[PDB]
Design a protein around this ligand. Structure first.
Ligand SMILES: [Zn+2]
Ligand SMILES: [Zn+2]
Ligand SMILES: [Zn+2]
Ligand SMILES: [Zn+2]
Ligand SMILES: [Zn+2]
Ligand SMILES: [Zn+2]
Ligand SMILES: [Zn+2]
Lengths: 153, 1731, 75, 71
């Protein structure tokens, strides 16, 4: 299966060189599913915030981008209330060369500046555009929750 | 003498002639009208000249079409019509030639030159006394305004005006006309008397004929139609005929009448469709009546039918009622006289264009004198009043003094009727009545009653064309006439009310009124305004406008309130009426000489009467329940008119400030008393909450509330202008200031209520209104309301608690504060926290800004401080460009551009732009960060924490102290009034202390931090104010009795999670500051409720971050989780070219790479003996401004050929590999044509494709060594290709055949040439490859290190070259070489096929002939050198000019010296016997330099060939190119001229030096491309040399000399500034607003495929690609004085210098043929519609 | 002054970029080395995006730094 | 729970729709109140298309909110 080899050399790339603040690993029984880590950048409101990610991969990974869902509480304008960050240009007719590390770095970059156009959490978008108090406070408390959420899987 | 009688007899007999007697069809109107025009022109020009002999002094004696005399023989010779209709006479009067240079010399008198379409207007923003003073081209002197803001504007259709040169009052500084920088026959008494007589007779005839033209009057046309109907059904035709004869024009010089016609009139009631339907219903007989008749109505009036018998026409005349078009019935003689007057007006306009200066200065003066002289002939001329009296007695009231003007009719005896004059009595000026102030109406007035007054009064009777002509001939002539300007002003003022009433109530097309032009060209003058104010006529104007307004008034709440127009106004006259009246008031006030004049009792009461109607006229109610279905639109008119009034007040303030003399304080006190009394006369519901506290009852969420309250704004202004004590004294004794301040506070409360989105149930219109109330463009309404509230608080020293209860009541917070309702269930529901945030901001604003109570040295300093504060509060968020900064700052602050620029320079520091398309930004100075208070009024738009954190970051010494620093509140008492120091009284009161305590307690209990930061900042400000008032270590006792310190301690000793660090740090700072002030009285309070051990531990807690433990545990958690991830990865691993669609498939399908294949404009021949072409060495890019843009004929033909001839095409590509099958699927699915498409990766335009083979150097020993020393046979390199397959081979055949067939990039000439087969494609492909290499070299010329420039930064270009080489090699190997049997480009003895034929032969020999490259280069170079030496030595125009040519070259640069061995070699090659000097080394040196410079491009292209050869044979990715054991970059970096040439010869040629090469014998080979080698351009190839400043192309277009394009080079093309500039060729292209905006310059006279045009007006360069119709606009490489680019740079007329780097980037984009790619990439998805 | 840049797949791009150079010019060098259009590229340093109008020194870029390329996520 | 929906013309409709409802249910309510074909319309929230499968709470839409409705 071409998708299996795709994930295999993605894992090789991760094991060799991992982008700063990003880490991932698949599961033995099903390599299709993944567990991913993201650290909020230094100057962002998400400083030192570690947030888990879950990536259920469709069988035709080259044709269809993986279905991605956050495993921790997130308050971001581009992140749905279910934690399902949505990707819709990765499935276009001509997609650029991408791997899981690339999309994880894209999410990490998005964590600094949101995309007000086409938002996912409408209240988060309105809170970011003006009245930043509740936005920054909610980001800080989500960082606290993500820190507190000790996982034992 | 007899001249007057003769003129009258001739003019009053036009219908008496038999030619005009009978009515004719529409096609016979045209020739009859031409005959009338010619006859009138001829007759009047004959008469105006003395006996008809003075014409040659005016017009050309012998014009064209001579062979029937030029001028009329006598009076009878000019009056006859047999000659005119026979087309025998000639239009001598026409002066439409090229000699008309509008040369007008004036001294003091105004230029008065009307502006044609496309002419510039030079509105200097500093010399002009106002914004209306313009200048014309011939009157503009650029020397006067070095370093000014000259906003150049292009005249349009709707823009009509005159120049103002020589008007000393209109310019702040004296100016010099450009003309001044460089036997009389019309001055005798007889001629001036004669012209006066002619003009007087003309105007008297005009007034006489139109005085009886009551038929098209809007007030009467209706009952004319009704009465004519009545007599046509009741069948009594005798009185119908009597009525028609009465209405008919009359002069003293069956039964139904005849020679009648029907005329309709234009209007704005209907569009084209309804008018056409009405015409079609009117008379079906009129052919094409829906087509021909409709457009004539578009210009004035038209005639739809005409016949002798009235019965037929009358039946069709009743089309008036069908659609309401104002159609009238008129006699043929009356129409003839009306047309005669129209042509008379045309003649008078034409007479103003005669070049004779003396004739003009006499004609204008006499015409003005006749216009302004008293109108006699009133008695003799027919009085029209008896007719309207007799036929319409019902509408004519006998006793009414306004019986006449209500019908737009003169008075008995032909006098101006009585206007609705209203003078107010002094006894009614004591107070401002709630309704209209009482006035008296005089019943007698003594008008001058002159010709001009009659003409202006008849303005409602004319048609559009005749109207516009009359204004254009009268208004500019009289207004510019310095002798008759004041007289014109008086005459139009005396009749102002009649004009205003006409344009308001009785006018068919109000927008064409003359009053707008009258006010614009008259009232905008200090002398006229001063004269108006000296009389009471200004009061008459104001009261006329007030009478216009009062018809739509309404009564609401005891006052008179304006209302939106709801009556039927299909003519829309009322909108124009209001706009014109308000503009007139504002203009007249703007130019008041004495600032006291508007404040005088009569003037002030009239102005306040005008402004009162709009005081709180607009009311909104908070919609609740269901959202409004449709957004309200009613507010627009209220916005407009209240903006006009606000501008009125601001203009009054401006004229008060600018005038040196001050204003008497008594006038200010009287104004304050009047306005305060009127506003206290309001009725307001009252209520009591406690026993002895009484406040107004008003629920903002339920009841109507108004944003704009101009009267309170005026009151705030007037109070500010005087002392506080004097303002209090001027207040009425029996008055309550809360009554007048509660409306301002209501506005503030409503704004803060809608800010938090409480009024979302109303439409977006209410939000638009609210945002308009904030930062209002014309005036600071919000700040004035805050000032009024501050005054109300400051002037209640007896019942301070009442103020706080009232203030907090309107916010609807009193229910919560008193405990009536809980905090959560206030009327605001969950939005209570935001409302409280706004409330705290409002209180802080009340306390902090004491600007209105300060006393500055001058009003200029006050304005400067306002500007500085606005800039500071607009900049500190982030650095911003000049345009955005101007956009943010309120409009009334930016008008004084010099002051704004000075303040901006003082406040911020300029940050230069870094990129190539970015604006220069301004960064606020760090030292000014300490002066920013993030809660003051100016920061209203932003939030609080964000501004706080930004200021903290800019104020923290490091990232550690981002949240550990506090913002000192900005409260001060510097330069403050004595009575203003007590603003802290309401804060230091017990009630407000309880309010603060309750707010803090609810914040702790509910744990909401939304308003906590604002509240802490407010408490800090209160403490700072108390310290400033009382002194050191002072604390307000109010916060001591109520223990707030416990609440602050609870804030401080939180869990660091309920509140952020900024809240916690601020609270502890407040505790420490107040505890340090007095610890004993304060430590007792803490232990009273929190015990003792908290307090004792607090001191231990003090003097010893918290998150350091948090950060450490976060880091430990990170380490644990990353270790877990690594363990999971380890256990998982222990458990176990790029396509566009076929990823990892490794398919053998060939990767076809999209490419662009099109001509280039960079190929041009270089004429020999040209020092500018070969001498100057190139140190990279440059630009010489001193030489004007210019093109030579041969070069222009070269560009045209390059556009046309296909032998100059070049391949450029993006190198994006794509499968052939995937490419076919892309073509089919996306439906792009195979001919032209866009790359599916970069979206770049592409037309041709070329595949890449799987190259490899395995199992071979190829290198550059045997390429130089052995054969370069194309097969000896094709051996690199891998072995192929039969399927692969046939696939290659198929793909190459389809590419050959389907690609049009291949030249049609060689396609149709004889013996052309598929094997000949290799030759033309190699030609295109050599052309691409030449393009690369030409582009590389622009870089500083030209020796090795082509090597660096051309990786993509080198990839394209390698791709092309591999593709052509694959084609040749698969198909086969053609053995060079066929020549694609024959060596014709008349045409040059390629400009790089030398390198073309080099390529042909190297690739095709299996011979060594090092010998082919020597052969080509030797042959070219021999040809060039023969041409240069045997050339002419130098034998006696060698000395001057050498001197010119030495002026350009340095000529190399030839050594004796080189002397001998050059002499051996060829010697000349023309050497007549002692030492002939000069010609040899010149030949040496010329040959070296000519050969250098070929040498560099050969090096590029070697480079691509190495790249094709490179061992490793990082392998430096080496030749004969030397690195090319190392051995050529610091090599110049002859040394560089010799080193290159050693590197690439089998020879060793230039001398050694010359020593080689004359080997002759008959290659087609070596015979008569063409010479190409040597110097730098680039775009034109633009001027240093773009202002030159606009300001000094007359001075600059530029080549022009003859296409449509007419119609004042020598002065219009609509042109573009072609950067490719320098040919200026005029835009005449026709034929696709003149895109024809691409199709001819320039390079066709693409070009770049510069627009100086918009300061943006446009790029056009002709294959589609597409084009784009990008910022021109010009950088404004204040860092700006694009269209924003040229606006405001700033100096616009040239940025070299941006222009070099543009040149590099153009040269490399990236312009089509750039254009394709810019649109993106938009470019798809082209294909 | 030398920096490294890793593309979307992971291929390292070697660049020599002046400290005062702009990010737009950096993307121009990226497309020169590879061919991905500059408007299709976003650079991230330490997880934060880079804007065109600021230099490399203003973003705290040292010798042999690593700058990444990311996707768009316009959805 | 009231949210305002702005149509193409400019008219606005208020809906008392619970957050637990679906976007398709919002379209059904709009059709029931105005007789507009839900298939043609595409409710978009501040530049983001709304999926009929997801609920209002999934997009976290609450209290007053303006939802432009484009046919
Ligand atoms: Zn000036
Ligand atoms: Zn002049
Ligand atoms: Zn002039
Ligand atoms: Zn493929
Ligand atoms: Zn491409
Ligand atoms: Zn041109
Ligand atoms: Zn300026």
């Amino acid at each position: 299966t071409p998708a299996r080899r795709r994930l295999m050399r993605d894992f090789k790339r991760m094991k060799e060189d991992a982008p700063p603040g990003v880490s991932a690993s698949p599961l033995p029984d099903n390599v299709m599913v993944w567990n991913a880590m993201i650290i909020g950048p230094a100057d962002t409101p998400y400083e030192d915030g570690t947030f888990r990610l879950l990536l259920e991969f469709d069988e035709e990974y080259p044709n269809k981008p993986p279905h991605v869902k956050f495993l921790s509480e997130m308050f971001h304008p581009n992140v749905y209330a279910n934690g399902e960050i949505c990707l819709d240009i990765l499935q276009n007719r001509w997609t650029p060369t991408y791997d899981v590390a690339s999309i994880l770095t894209s999410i990490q970059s998005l964590f600094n500046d949101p995309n007000p156009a086409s938002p996912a959490n409408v209240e988060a978008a309105t809170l970011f555009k003006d009245h930043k108090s509740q936005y920054v406070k909610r980001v800080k408390e989500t960082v606290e929750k993500s820190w507190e959420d000790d996982m034992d899987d | 003498g007899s001249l007057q009688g003769h003129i009258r007899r001739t003019l009053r007999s036009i219908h008496n002639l038999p030619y005009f007697r009978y009515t004719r069809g529409p096609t016979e109107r045209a020739d009859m009208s031409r005959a009338l025009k010619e006859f009138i022109y001829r007759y009047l020009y004959f008469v105006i000249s003395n006996s008809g002999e003075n014409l040659p002094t005016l017009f050309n004696a012998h014009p064209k079409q001579k062979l029937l005399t030029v001028f009329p023989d006598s009076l009878e010779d000019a009056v006859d019509i047999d000659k005119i209709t026979s087309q025998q006479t000639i239009p001598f009067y026409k002066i439409d030639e090229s000699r008309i240079g509008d040369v007008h010399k004036h001294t003091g008198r105004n230029c008065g030159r009307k502006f044609k379409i496309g002419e510039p207007l030079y509105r200097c923003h500093e010399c002009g006394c106002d914004d209306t003073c313009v200048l014309c081209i011939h009157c503009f002197n650029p020397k006067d305004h070095v370093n000014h803001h000259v906003c150049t504007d292009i005249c349009t259709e709707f823009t009509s005006g005159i120049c103002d040169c020589g008007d000393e009052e209109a310019w702040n500084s004296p100016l010099h006309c450009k003309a001044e920088e460089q036997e009389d026959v019309w001055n005798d008494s007889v001629n001036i008397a004669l012209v006066e007589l002619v003009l007087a007779e003309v105007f008297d005839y005009f007034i006489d004929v139109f005085n009886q033209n009551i038929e098209p009057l809007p007030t009467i046309q209706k009952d004319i139609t009704i009465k004519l109907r009545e007599m046509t059904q009741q069948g009594k035709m005798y009185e119908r005929a009597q009525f028609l004869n009465d209405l008919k024009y009359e002069n003293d010089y069956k039964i139904d009448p005849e020679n009648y016609t029907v005329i309709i009139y234009n209007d704005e009631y209907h569009n084209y469709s309804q008018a056409t339907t009405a015409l079609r219903q009117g008379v079906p007989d009129n052919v094409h009546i829906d087509l021909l008749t409709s457009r004539i109505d578009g210009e004035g009036r038209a005639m739809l039918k005409c016949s002798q018998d009235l019965s037929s026409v009358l039946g069709g005349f009743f089309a008036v009622q069908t659609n309401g078009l104002s159609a009238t019935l008129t006699s043929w003689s009356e129409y003839l006289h009306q047309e005669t007057c129209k042509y008379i007006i045309l003649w008078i306009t034409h007479c103003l264009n005669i070049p004779n200066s003396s004739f003009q200065t006499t004609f204008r003066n006499m015409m003005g004198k006749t216009l302004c002289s008293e109108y006699l002939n009133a008695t003799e001329c027919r009085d029209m009043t008896p007719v309207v009296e007799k036929y319409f007695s019902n509408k004519f009231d006998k006793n009414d003094p306004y019986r006449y003007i209500d019908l737009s009719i003169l008075a008995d005896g032909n006098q101006i009727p009585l206007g609705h004059h209203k003078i107010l009595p002094e006894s009614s000026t004591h107070s401002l009545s709630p309704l209209i102030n009482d006035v008296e109406t005089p019943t007698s007035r003594t008008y001058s009653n002159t010709r001009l007054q009659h003409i202006l009064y008849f303005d409602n009777r004319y048609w559009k064309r005749l109207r516009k002509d009359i204004q254009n001939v009268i208004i500019p002539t009289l207004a510019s006439s310095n002798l008759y300007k004041p007289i014109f002003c008086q005459q139009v003022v005396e009749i102002f009310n009649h004009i205003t009433r006409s344009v308001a109530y009785m006018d068919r097309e109000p927008q064409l009124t003359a009053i707008r032009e009258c006010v614009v060209q008259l009232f905008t003058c200090p002398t006229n305004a001063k004269n108006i104010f000296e009389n009471q006529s200004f009061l008459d104007i104001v009261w006329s406008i007030i009478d216009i307004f009062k018809e739509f008034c309404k009564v609401e709440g005891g006052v008179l309130i304006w209302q939106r127009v709801q009556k039927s106004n299909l003519t829309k006259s009322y909108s124009i009426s209001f706009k014109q009246g308000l503009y007139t008031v504002e203009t007249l006030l703007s130019k008041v000489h004495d600032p006291n004049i508007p404040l005088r009792p009569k003037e002030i009461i009239s102005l306040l009467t005008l402004c009162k109607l709009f005081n709180g006229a607009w009311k909104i109610k908070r919609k609740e329940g269901e959202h409004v279905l449709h957004e309200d639109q009613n507010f627009i008119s209220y916005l407009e008119y209240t903006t006009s009034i606000y501008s009125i007040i601001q203009t009054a303030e401006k004229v008060s400030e600018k005038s040196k003399d001050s204003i008497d304080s008594k006038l200010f006190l009287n104004a304050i008393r009047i306005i305060s009394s009127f506003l206290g006369n309001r009725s307001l519901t009252y209520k009591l909450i406690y026993d002895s506290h009484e406040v107004i009852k008003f629920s903002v969420s339920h009841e109507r509330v108004a944003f704009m309250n101009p009267l309170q704004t005026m009151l705030s202004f007037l109070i500010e202008k005087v002392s506080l004590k004097d303002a209090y004294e001027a207040l009425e004794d029996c008055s309550d200031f809360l009554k007048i301040s509660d409306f301002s506070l209501r506005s503030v409360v409503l704004c803060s209520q809608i800010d938090v989105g409480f009024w979302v149930r109303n439409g977006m219109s209410v939000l638009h209104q609210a945002s308009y109330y904030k930062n209002n463009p014309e005036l600071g309404s919000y700040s004035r309301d805050i000032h009024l509230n501050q005054l109300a608080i400051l002037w209640e020293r007896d019942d301070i608690p009442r103020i706080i209860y009232n203030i907090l009541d309107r916010w609807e917070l009193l229910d919560w504060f008193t405990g009536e309702v809980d905090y959560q269930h206030t009327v605001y529901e969950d939005k209570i926290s935001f409302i409280i945030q706004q409330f705290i901001a409002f209180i802080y604003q009340i306390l902090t800004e004491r600007q209105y109570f300060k006393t500055f040295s001058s009003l200029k300093d006050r304005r400067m401080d306002q500007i500085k504060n606005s800039i500071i509060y607009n900049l500190y968020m982030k650095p911003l460009s000049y345009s955005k900064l101007l956009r943010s700052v309120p409009d009334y602050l930016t008008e004084d551009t010099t002051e704004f620029d000075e303040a901006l320079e003082e406040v911020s520091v300029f940050v230069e732009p870094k990129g190539l398309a970015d604006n220069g930004v301004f960064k606020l100075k760090a030292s000014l960060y300490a002066k920013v208070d993030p809660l003051k009024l100016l920061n209203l738009e932003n939030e609080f924490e964000s501004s706080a954190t930004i200021i903290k970051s800019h104020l923290a010494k490091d990232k550690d102290e981002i949240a550990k620093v506090v913002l000192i509140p900005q409260v001060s008492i510097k330069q403050l009034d004595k009575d203003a120091l007590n603003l802290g009284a309401f804060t230091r009161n017990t009630v407000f202390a309880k309010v603060v305590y309750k707010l803090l307690q609810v914040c702790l209990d509910m744990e909401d931090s939304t308003f906590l930061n604002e509240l802490l900042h407010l408490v800090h400000g209160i403490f700072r104010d108390d310290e400033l008032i009382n002194g050191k270590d002072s604390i307000p006792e109010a916060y001591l009795s109520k223990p707030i310190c416990n609440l602050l301690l609870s804030i401080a000793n939180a869990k660091s999670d309920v509140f952020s660090e900024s809240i916690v740090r601020k609270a502890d700072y407040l505790l420490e500051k107040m505890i340090m002030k007095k610890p004993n009285e304060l430590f007792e309070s803490l232990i009273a409720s929190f015990g003792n051990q908290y307090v004792n531990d607090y001191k231990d807690k003090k003097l010893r971050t918290e998150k350091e433990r948090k950060r450490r545990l976060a880091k430990k958690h990170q380490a644990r989780l990353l270790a877990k991830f690594n363990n999971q990865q380890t256990k998982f691993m222990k458990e176990h070219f790029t396509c566009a669609l076929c990823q990892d498939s490794s398919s053998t399908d060939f990767f076809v790479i999209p490419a662009y294949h099109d001509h280039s404009p960079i190929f041009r021949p270089g004429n020999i003996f040209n020092p500018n072409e070969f001498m100057p060495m190139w140190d990279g890019f440059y630009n010489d401004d001193e030489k004007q843009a210019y093109i030579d004929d041969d070069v222009l033909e070269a560009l045209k050929e390059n556009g046309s001839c296909g032998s100059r095409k070049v391949f450029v590509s993006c190198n994006h590999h794509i499968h052939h099958n995937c490419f076919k699927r892309y073509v089919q699915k996306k439906r792009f044509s195979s001919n032209a498409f866009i790359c599916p990766l970069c979206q770049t335009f592409s037309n041709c494709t070329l595949p890449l083979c799987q190259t490899s150097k395995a199992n071979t020993g190829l290198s550059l060594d045997m390429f130089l020393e052995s054969e370069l046979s194309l097969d000896t390199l094709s051996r690199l290709f891998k072995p192929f397959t039969e399927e692969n081979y046939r696939t290659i055949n198929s793909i190459f055949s389809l590419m050959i067939s389907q690609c049009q990039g291949f030249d049609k000439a060689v396609r149709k040439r004889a013996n052309f087969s598929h094997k000949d494609v290799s030759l033309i492909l190699s030609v295109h490859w050599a052309n691409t290499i030449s393009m690369l070299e030409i582009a590389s010329r622009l870089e500083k290190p030209y020796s090795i420039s082509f090597f660096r930064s051309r990786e993509q270009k080198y990839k394209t070259l390698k791709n092309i080489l591999v593709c052509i090699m694959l084609f040749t190997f698969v198909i086969g070489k053609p053995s060079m049997e066929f020549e694609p480009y024959p060596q014709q003895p008349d045409t040059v096929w390629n400009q790089n034929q030398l390198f073309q032969y080099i390529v042909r020999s190297a690739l095709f002939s299996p011979v060594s490259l090092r010998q082919t280069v020597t052969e080509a170079l030797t042959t070219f050198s021999r040809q060039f030496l023969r041409d240069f030595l045997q050339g002419l125009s130098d034998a006696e000019q060698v000395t001057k040519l050498y001197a010119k070259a030495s002026k350009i640069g340095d000529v190399l010296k030839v050594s004796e061995q080189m002397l001998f070699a050059l002499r051996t090659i060829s010697d000349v016997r023309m050497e007549g000097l002692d030492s002939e080394s000069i010609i040899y040196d010149l030949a040496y330099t010329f040959l070296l410079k000519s050969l250098l491009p070929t040498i560099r292209r050969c090096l590029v060939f070697i480079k691509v050869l190495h790249e094709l044979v490179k061992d490793s990715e990082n392998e430096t190119l080496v030749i004969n054991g030397h690195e090319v970059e190392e051995e050529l970096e610091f090599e110049d001229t002859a040394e560089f040439v010799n080193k290159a010869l050693k590197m690439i040629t089998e020879k060793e030096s230039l001398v050694d090469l010359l020593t080689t014998q004359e080997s002759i080979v008959s290659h087609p491309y070596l015979e008569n080698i063409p010479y190409e351009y040597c110097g730098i190839i680039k775009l034109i040399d633009l001027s240093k400043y773009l202002n030159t192309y606009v300001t000094q277009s007359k001075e600059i000399k530029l080549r022009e394009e003859r296409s449509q080079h007419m119609k004042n093309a020598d002065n219009r500034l609509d042109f573009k500039i072609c950067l490719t060729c320098g040919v200026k292209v005029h835009l005449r607003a026709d034929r696709h905006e003149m895109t024809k310059h691409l199709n001819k006279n320039c390079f066709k495929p693409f070009g770049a045009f510069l627009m100086p007006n918009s300061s943006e360069v446009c790029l056009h690609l002709t294959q589609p119709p597409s084009n784009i606009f990008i910022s021109a490489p010009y950088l404004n004085s204040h860092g700006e680019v694009g269209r924003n740079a040229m606006r405001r007329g700033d100096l616009t210098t040239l940025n070299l780097k941006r222009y070099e980037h543009l040149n590099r984009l153009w040269i490399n043929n990236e312009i089509p790619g750039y254009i394709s990439r810019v649109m993106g998805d938009e470019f798809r519609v082209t294909i | 002054m030398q920096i490294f840049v890793k593309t979307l797949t992971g291929k390292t791009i070697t660049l020599e970029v002046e400290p005062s150079d702009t990010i737009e010019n950096v993307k121009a060098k990226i497309q020169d080395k590879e061919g991905i259009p500059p408007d299709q590229q976003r650079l991230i340093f330490a997880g934060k995006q880079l804007e065109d109008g600021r230099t490399l020194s203003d973003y705290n870029i040292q010798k042999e730094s690593t700058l990444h390329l990311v996707l768009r996520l316009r959805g």
